[PDB]
Ligand binder design. Structure first.
Ligand SMILES: *C(=O)[C@@H]([C@@H]1NC(C(=O)O)=C(S[C@@H]2CN[C@H](C(=O)N(C)C)C2)[C@@H]1C)[C@@H](C)O
Length: 237
């Protein structure tokens, strides 16, 4: 499992949490206590805050305004859940603006998300700082989401869980969110989520790694699923 990790020159940590114990794997374990920008993984918290504070619904269609976005794949209409899986920044920036800086700040503090700092710009703080979060905090946040244990209404947590539903493999279910922060140095790669196993156990996970411009986009998920197979959490079908 260690051999898997250093087949790349990836500098990387993989964290698991089962509600009592944190386990760490990879090439650079100190990464798990290290704080990084959440990038696209912040969409989980943005969705939760938005639904809880009645700023959006899980059925609302955020329409494209016709102005070309950073990626052409984002030049369409999205619900929050579709935007979650496509990582559609401008949709979640619209949501963040509906929320507003003081409510966003008060809410991230209330729920104890990372360092709880947003600064002045309500649509940039998760992409360039000053908000940072450790992979351990990330694994515990999504674990709590999985259990309905976050400080949000139960139906809100359920809605955001379904936004993260990415694979069914028998009676096992995978929930995940990827992230690639490119506007910081060094670049940060995330793949965070949980597996709801057929036996009833949930295991939460977080991949956190250094990235750079060459890197293939699928590598984070591949790695994660690789490790989860090796650990026995989510076997390849
Ligand atoms: C979030 O961290 C950023 C997005 N995160 C990801 C990602 O996790 O893969 C991407 S990749 C981007 C969106 N999908 C485009 C694509 O796959 N095609 C056009 C085929 C590439 C983003 C970098 C967000 C902050 O931008």
């Amino acid at each position: 499992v260690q051999a898997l990790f250093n087949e790349i020159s990836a500098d990387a940590v993989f964290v698991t949490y089962d509600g009592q114990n944190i386990k760490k794997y990879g090439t650079h374990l100190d990464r798990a206590k290290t704080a990084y920008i959440p990038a696209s993984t912040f969409k989980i918290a943005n969705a939760l805050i938005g639904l809880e504070n009645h700023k959006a619904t899980s059925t609302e269609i955020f329409k494209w305004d016709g102005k070309p976005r950073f990626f052409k794949a984002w030049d369409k209409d999205f619900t929050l859940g579709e935007a979650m899986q496509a990582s559609t920044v401008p949709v979640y920036q619209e949501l963040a603006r509906r929320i507003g800086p003081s409510l966003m700040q008060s809410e991230l503090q209330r729920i104890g998300y990372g360092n709880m700092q947003i600064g002045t710009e309500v649509d940039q703080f998760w992409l360039k700082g000053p908000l940072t979060i450790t992979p351990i905090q990330e694994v515990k946040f999504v674990y709590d989401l999985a259990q309905g244990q976050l400080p949000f209404k139960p139906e809100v947590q359920q809605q955001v869980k379904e936004m993260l539903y990415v694979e069914r493999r028998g009676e096992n279910r995978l929930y995940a969110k990827s992230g690639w922060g490119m506007a910081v140095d060094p670049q940060v790669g995330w793949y965070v989520g949980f597996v709801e196993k057929a036996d009833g156990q949930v295991v939460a996970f977080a991949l956190n790694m250094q990235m750079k411009a060459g890197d293939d986009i699928a590598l984070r998920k591949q790695l994660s699923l690789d490790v989860l197979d090796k650990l026995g959490v989510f076997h390849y079908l």
